[PDB]
């Protein structure tokens, strides 16, 4: 979920960008690979705050490839999920293995062993969705899902969702 | 020629001064590791032989041995030997069912060249056929080749001059070789002078 953090990033500035105006180049090259970037250390970083002043240290010239190495300390909003967290979202894809719900920039999977037994798969219906005796869960449908387990790699985060808990599912 | 170098007459080198032959013999043997794990002196073909060397195979014959008299160059194969491998493998991409054999041939040295002097085929004590190929080349003396007198005054050739550049007597005799005076007093080699 949504946090704000003070992060320090190490950036390889190439010697080709040693122009008179490296500050906006450094801020820009911060701003491609952070916006929407996923890190397992802090979650999905979305937007960088305090763009007018960002702490830029005196850069390290690496002794082999000549590139400048800057430890830029910045403040940004992040999306770090956890397990045990219930969130709202919309289903973007479904299958017999389960369905993917979109919570922010994240596609949380709900596995086929994690719905209540009333829901069942019907591939004959277009789009193929999960149908129960009391509700139906299709593509682009509102649903409330709880996350029971999240795995975070160095650059990717995957989560496990369910709707077996009471007061979950479609609102 | 300073400090253990010589200046050798290049015209003398042209006329055969210190020119010499160099024979190298290559011995290769086919052996049976068991029933069918053996190898055969044969000229390999690209259709059915795996892991050949990049040197040319054209100088070989039907028996996988180069005839004597044929000039050889660097990394040319002189003894073509192949052994079968386990069929229907998958290695390096260029592996098919045709490649029933791998190449165990013997190339020449990467720097050596010359003429195949004599090819000798026979059997060993064990009755296995093995070959000996003698390659003859000539080492014309050049810059850097080491020469010694009979007095411990060794050294390399510094440079080679033609006859018109070397000093000469009133009789027109040029030296074949110039040594330096500085080789004499430190070593106290008087017998070199007395021998001269």
């Amino acid at each position: 979920m949504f946090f704000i953090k003070d992060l320090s990033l190490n950036i390889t500035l190439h010697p080709s960008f040693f122009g008179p105006r490296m500050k906006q180049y450094l801020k820009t090259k911060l701003l491609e690979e952070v916006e929407g970037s996923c890190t397992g250390k802090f979650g999905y970083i979305l937007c960088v705050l305090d763009y007018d002043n960002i702490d830029i240290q005196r850069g390290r010239i690496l002794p082999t490839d000549g590139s400048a190495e800057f430890n830029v300390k910045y403040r940004a909003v992040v999306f770090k999920p956890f397990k045990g967290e219930v969130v709202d979202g919309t289903v973007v894809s479904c299958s017999q293995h389960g369905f993917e719900v979109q919570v922010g920039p994240m596609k949380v999977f709900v596995t086929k062993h994690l719905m209540p037994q009333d829901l069942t798969f019907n591939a004959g219906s277009n789009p193929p969705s999960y149908q129960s005796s009391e509700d139906v869960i299709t593509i682009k449908s509102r649903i409330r899902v709880k996350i029971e387990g999240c795995i975070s790699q160095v650059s990717s985060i995957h989560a496990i969702g369910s709707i077996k808990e009471d007061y979950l599912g479609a609102i | 020629n300073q400090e253990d170098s010589m200046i050798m007459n290049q015209s003398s080198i042209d006329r055969g001064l210190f020119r010499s032959l160099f024979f190298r013999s290559y011995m290769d043997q086919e052996k049976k590791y068991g029933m069918s794990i053996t190898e055969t002196f044969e000229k390999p073909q690209r259709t059915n032989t795996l892991r050949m060397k990049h040197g040319t195979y054209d100088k070989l014959d039907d028996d996988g041995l180069i005839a004597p008299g044929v000039r050889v160059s660097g990394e040319d194969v002189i003894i073509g030997k192949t052994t079968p491998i386990s069929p229907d493998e998958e290695e390096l991409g260029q592996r098919t069912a045709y490649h029933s054999k791998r190449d165990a041939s013997t190339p020449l040295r990467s720097t050596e060249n010359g003429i195949v002097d004599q090819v000798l085929v026979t059997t060993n004590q064990d009755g296995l056929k093995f070959v000996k190929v003698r390659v003859r080349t000539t080492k014309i003396p050049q810059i850097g080749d080491k020469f010694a007198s009979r007095h411990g005054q060794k050294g390399t050739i510094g440079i080679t001059y033609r006859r018109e550049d070397m000093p000469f007597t009133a009789e027109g005799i040029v030296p074949d070789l110039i040594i330096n005076p500085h080789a004499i007093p430190s070593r106290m080699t008087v017998a070199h002078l007395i021998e001269c």
């Binding site: 040693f18 008179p20 105006r21 490296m22 500050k23 005196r58 850069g59 390290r60 010239i61 002794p63 400048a68 | -």
Partner: protein, 112 residues
């Protein structure tokens, strides 16, 4: 006084054949050999026993035993010596490596 006599002996050995060496070299030798308060010999049991890094010590002599003692004692190597950077293949903090090159921005933007 032992250091002075040691320098005198080393100088006598060097100048025995008339060969001349600048004073600071043998001065550095006898200062290293007497820096611990004792005549620390240049042996596998002399300078090779000070806690100067496991990799530096194992590079000289008794390599496997030194690594055994380091593993038993859980010795931490600060990697400031030359030999540790040789084995790690990184820039030794010597000569050109004895500093770091930072990039300036203020004079750079002052240039034009």
């Amino acid at each position: 006084a032992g250091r002075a006599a040691l320098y005198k002996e080393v100088y006598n050995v060097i100048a025995s054949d008339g060969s001349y060496v600048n004073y600071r070299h043998m001065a550095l030798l006898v200062d290293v050999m007497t820096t611990q308060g004792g005549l620390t010999s240049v042996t596998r049991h002399g300078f090779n026993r000070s806690n100067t890094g496991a990799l530096m010590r194992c590079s000289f002599e008794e390599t496997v035993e030194i690594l055994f003692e380091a593993g038993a004692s859980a010795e931490l190597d600060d990697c400031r010596g030359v030999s540790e950077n040789v084995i790690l293949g990184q820039m030794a903090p010597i000569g050109t490596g004895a500093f770091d090159v930072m990039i300036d921005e203020e004079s750079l933007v002052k240039y034009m």
